[PDB]
């Protein structure tokens, strides 16, 4: 259902990233700022996936 979950699969291998995963039932509360992620009315910025794919891909 949310807009941020709709991620296209990229062709090339991509560099990983480290933070700590926290559960989703905790993060969708009324006092959390990510209920605005859960609501579609927010400003949806589309990242240029082609730019990240040409730049941040793993070299062969």
């Amino acid at each position: 259902v949310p807009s941020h979950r709709r991620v296209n699969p990229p062709t090339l291998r991509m560099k990983k990233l480290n933070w700590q995963k926290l559960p989703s039932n905790v993060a969708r509360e009324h006092n959390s700022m990510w209920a605005s992620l859960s609501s579609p009315d927010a400003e949806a910025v589309e990242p240029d996936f082609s730019s990240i794919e040409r730049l941040f891909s793993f070299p062969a």
Partner: protein, 322 residues
């Protein structure tokens, strides 16, 4: 006349002579504004030196057993006789020291406690911070696809520190640099993100328990001093009771502000969905001060990157023209 008949030793008389010579006046005036209740020429350090040069029991007994001419004594002993002529002089000096210290501690703690209250109130209600977390978690859920760390719908505030840990292939562009560079092109309202959070800026910069213990100790000392003045004479009452009541009222308002800080601290702990047993007050303020400094350096380094890119483009157009 070398027989100055001073009951003190050399060192304490030397210190009291250095103390007496700063006032550029006679010790009669000194005992006068000790008695009259003046705060102009007495800050904390001068009263601390005066309490550190108090007369002792044998010194007071030797001064009271003295029966010859008063002019034969030293300036130190005449100052101590003028001090002993004041009834409850140590109580009056303690009222001086505690009212001046209470005023100094109130003017130090109260704007900073208001800054802490404004900090946590703006942290509880922020406008562009949801949209900044929208853009951050969109890029983050794009990046960690197909792994155990992916498909999350939120993070703590400490993840805002971990944005700086990301570095590109060039090891010069962070994730925060790329997010602010995209936000400068697409949604510039996130560039007004420190404007709502400027009252969270500079953090507290202190430890709140230290100033709270100092304020509680000062309020307890003011209550004890008010009880001691209540046992004293009515001149001390009309000299000090209004100022002591104003200090007790201001410290009670400060304790109400501390209780409001505790309530908003519990609200901020539930707001970021963290338990209240861990440090969710000073860690969050140092977190927000650190993250806003990261925001300001990321803004100015993106501006410097665009400026040097424009200068290099002008140099390339120059060498193509020539």
């Amino acid at each position: 006349e070398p027989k100055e008949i001073t009951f003190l030793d050399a060192k304490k008389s030397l210190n009291l002579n250095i103390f007496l010579k700063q006032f550029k006046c006679s010790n009669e005036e000194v005992a006068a504004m000790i008695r009259a209740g003046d705060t102009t020429k007495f800050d904390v350090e001068v009263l601390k030196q005066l309490l550190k040069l108090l007369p002792e029991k044998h010194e007071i007994e030797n001064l009271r057993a003295f029966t010859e001419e008063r002019a034969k004594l030293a300036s130190a002993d005449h100052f101590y006789l003028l001090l002993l002529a004041i009834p409850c002089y140590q109580l009056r000096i303690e009222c001086m020291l505690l009212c001046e210290g209470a005023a100094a501690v109130l003017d130090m703690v109260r704007p900073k406690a208001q800054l802490v209250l404004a900090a946590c109130e703006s942290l509880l209600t922020s406008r562009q911070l949801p949209i900044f977390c929208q853009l951050i978690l969109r890029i983050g859920n794009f990046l960690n696809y197909g792994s155990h760390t992916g498909d999350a719908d939120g993070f703590k505030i400490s993840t805002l520190l971990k944005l700086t840990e990301t570095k590109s292939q060039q090891n010069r562009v962070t994730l925060l640099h790329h997010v602010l560079e995209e936000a400068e092109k697409s949604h510039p309202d996130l560039l007004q993100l420190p404007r709502d959070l400027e009252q969270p800026s500079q953090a507290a910069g202190i430890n709140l328990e230290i100033i709270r213990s100092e304020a509680s100790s000062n309020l307890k000392k003011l209550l004890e001093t008010e009880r001691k003045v209540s046992a004293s004479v009515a001149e001390v009452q009309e000299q000090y009771t209004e100022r002591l009541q104003a200090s007790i009222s201001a410290f009670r308002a400060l304790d109400e502000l501390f209780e409001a800080i505790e309530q908003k601290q519990r609200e901020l702990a539930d707001y970021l969905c963290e338990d209240a047993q861990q440090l969710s007050l000073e860690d969050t303020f140092s977190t927000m001060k650190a993250f806003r400094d990261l925001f300001l350096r990321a803004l100015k380094e993106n501006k410097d990157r665009k400026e040097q890119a424009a200068k290099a483009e002008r140099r390339k157009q120059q060498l193509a023209e020539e």
